[PDB]
Amino acid sequence: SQTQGIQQLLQAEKRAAEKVADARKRKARRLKQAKEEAQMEVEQYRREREQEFQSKQ
Amino acid sequence: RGNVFLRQAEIENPLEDPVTGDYVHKSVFIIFFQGDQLKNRVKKICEGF
């Protein structure tokens, strides 16, 4: 009977652990966004440098 | 200030106290709490009594 509320505690902590897991997913997705943004800008940089090389050449 | 359910049970035929020899009836009325401070001071108190 009291195990009902002990299981309520376990439900609360399981919901919290789901939040931690989804927040680790948020961390990883932030890292993926960092990768994608960095590769995007460095690709623009590389294209620009190549274009200046060709113009000056 | 603790507010968690009570695991209740009773001991019959109370075997004598291990160190003295008192055949006195016993029981358990147990509760669990999260606070670490409680785990210090509550247990200090129970050791006291």
From Swiss-Prot, chain A:
Note the superkingdom of the native organism. Answer: Eukaryota
Q: Where is the composition biased (Basic and acidic residues)?
A: 33-53
Q: Where in the cell is it found?
A: Melanosome; Cytoplasmic vesicle, Clathrin-coated vesicle membrane
* UniProt similarity note: Belongs to the V-ATPase G subunit family.
Q: What does this protein do?
A: Subunit of the V1 complex of vacuolar(H+)-ATPase (V-ATPase), a multisubunit enzyme composed of a peripheral complex (V1) that hydrolyzes ATP and a membrane integral complex (V0) that translocates protons. V-ATPase is responsible for acidifying and maintaining the pH of intracellular compartments and in some cell types, is targeted to the plasma membrane, where it is responsible for acidifying the extracellular environment.
Q: Assembly and partners? A: V-ATPase is a heteromultimeric enzyme made up of two complexes: the ATP-hydrolytic V1 complex and the proton translocation V0 complex. The V1 complex consists of three catalytic AB heterodimers that form a heterohexamer, three peripheral stalks each consisting of EG heterodimers, one central rotor including subunits D and F, and the regulatory subunits C and H. The proton translocation complex V0 consists of the proton transport subunit a, a ring of proteolipid subunits c9c'', rotary subunit d, subunits e and f, and the accessory subunits ATP6AP1/Ac45 and ATP6AP2/PRR.
**Name of the protein:** V-type proton ATPase subunit G 2
Its source organism is: Mus musculus
Section covered of the full-length record: 3 to 59 of 118
Swiss-Prot record, chain B:
User: What happens when the protein's gene is inactivated?
Assistant: Embryonic lethal. Knockout embryos die at 5 to 6 dpc, before gastrulation.
Found in which tissues? Predominantly expressed in neurons in the cortex and in the dentate gyrus, CA1 and CA3 regions of the hippocampus (at protein level). Expressed at lower levels in astrocytes, oligodendrocytes and microglia (at protein level). In the cerebellum, present in Purkinje and granule cells (at protein level).
Q: Where in the cell is it found?
A: Cytoplasmic vesicle, Clathrin-coated vesicle membrane; Cytoplasmic vesicle, Secretory vesicle, Synaptic vesicle membrane; Melanosome
Q: Which residues form the signal peptide?
A: none
This protein's assembly is summarised as: V-ATPase is a heteromultimeric enzyme made up of two complexes: the ATP-hydrolytic V1 complex and the proton translocation V0 complex. The V1 complex consists of three catalytic AB heterodimers that form a heterohexamer, three peripheral stalks each consisting of EG heterodimers, one central rotor including subunits D and F, and the regulatory subunits C and H. The proton translocation complex V0 consists of the proton transport subunit a, a ring of proteolipid subunits c9c'', rotary subunit d, subunits e and f, and the accessory subunits ATP6AP1/Ac45 and ATP6AP2/PRR. Interacts with SPAAR.
- What is the stated purpose of this protein? Subunit of the V0 complex of vacuolar(H+)-ATPase (V-ATPase), a multisubunit enzyme composed of a peripheral complex (V1) that hydrolyzes ATP and a membrane integral complex (V0) that translocates protons. V-ATPase is responsible for the acidification of various organelles, such as lysosomes, endosomes, the trans-Golgi network, and secretory granules, including synaptic vesicles. In certain cell types, can be exported to the plasma membrane, where it is involved in the acidification of the extracellular environment. Required for assembly and activity of the vacuolar ATPase.
Describe the family membership recorded for this protein in Swiss-Prot or TrEMBL: Belongs to the V-ATPase 116 kDa subunit family.
Q: What is this protein called?
A: V-type proton ATPase 116 kDa subunit a 1
* Naturally occurring in which organism (per UniProt): Mus musculus
